Amino acid sequence: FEIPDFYVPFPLECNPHLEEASRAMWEWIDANGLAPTERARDRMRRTGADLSGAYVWPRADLDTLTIGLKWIALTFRIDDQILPARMTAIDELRGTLHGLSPTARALGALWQETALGRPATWCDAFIGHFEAFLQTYTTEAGLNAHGAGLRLDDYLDRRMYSVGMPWLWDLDELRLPIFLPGSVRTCGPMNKLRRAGALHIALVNDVFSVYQHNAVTIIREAQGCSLQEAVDQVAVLVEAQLHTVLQARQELLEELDRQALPSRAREAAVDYAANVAANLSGQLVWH
Ligand SMILES: C=C[C@](C)(O)CC/C=C(\C)CCC=C(C)C
- Number of the ligand 1 atom closest to the C-alpha atom of 205: 5
Name the binding residues. 79, 159, 205, 209
Residue type, 72: I
Q: Is 72 in the pocket of ligand 1 (CB under 6 A)?
A: yes
Alpha helices in the chain (DSSP H): 18-32, 38-47, 49-56, 62-81, 84-96, 102-115, 120-144, 152-162, 165-172, 182-185, 188-209, 215-223, 227-259, 263-286
- Indicate the top mutation candidate among 43, 47, 52, 78 to test ligand 1's pocket, ranked by most ligand atoms within 8 A of CB: 52
Say if residue 48 is exposed, middle or buried (CB neighbours under 10 Å; 0-12, 13-18, 19+): middle
Residue 244: HSE in the Cβ half-sphere, 13 Å Cα cutoff = 21
Structural domains of the chain in order of their starting residue, each with its CATH number: 1-287 (1.10.600.10)
- Number of the ligand 1 atom closest to the C-alpha atom of 164: 13
- Indicate the top mutation candidate among 163, 204, 275, 281 to test ligand 1's pocket, ranked by most ligand atoms within 8 A of CB: 163
Length in residues, the chain: 287
Report whether 106 contacts 32 (CB < 8 A). yes
Task: Determine which residue's CA is closest to atom 11 belonging to ligand 1.
Answer: 72
Compute CA distances 53 → 18, 21, 36, 78, 201, whole Å. 8, 9, 22, 17, 14
DSSP assignment of 7-68 equals: ---S-----TTHHHHHHHHHHHHHHHTSS-SHHHHHHHHHHTHHHHHHHHSTT--HHHHHHH
For residues 62-82, one letter each, b for 16 or more C-beta atoms within 10 angstroms of the residue's C-beta and e for the rest, the string is eebbbbbbbbbbbbbbbeeee
* Whole-angstrom distance, CA of residue 108 vs CA of residue 256: 35
Q: Helix 263-286 crosses helix 165-172 at what angle (to 10 degrees)?
A: 140
This structure was determined by X-ray
- 3-class DSSP state of 196: helix
* Whole-angstrom distance, CA of residue 118 vs CA of residue 127: 13
Quick one: CA torsion of 163, 169, 171, 175, rounded to 10 degrees? 150
Question: Given its phi and psi angles, is residue 61 left (phi above 0), alpha (psi -120 to 50 degrees) or beta?
Answer: beta
- Distance spanning both ends of the chain, measured CA to CA: 16
Question: Given its phi and psi angles, is residue 228 left (phi above 0), alpha (psi -120 to 50 degrees) or beta?
Answer: alpha
Which of 234, 285, 68, 90 is closest to 165 using CA atoms?
68
Say if residue 100 is exposed, middle or buried (CB neighbours under 10 Å; 0-12, 13-18, 19+): exposed
- 3-class DSSP state of 145: coil
Question: After what residue numbers is the chain broken, C–N > 2.5 angstroms?
Answer: 82, 100, 210
Which of 134, 135, 138, 74 is closest to 108 using CA atoms?
74
Angstrom resolution of this structure: 1.5
Name the binding residues for substrate. 159
- 3-class DSSP state of 134: helix
Q: Is 283 in the pocket of ligand 1 (CB under 6 A)?
A: yes
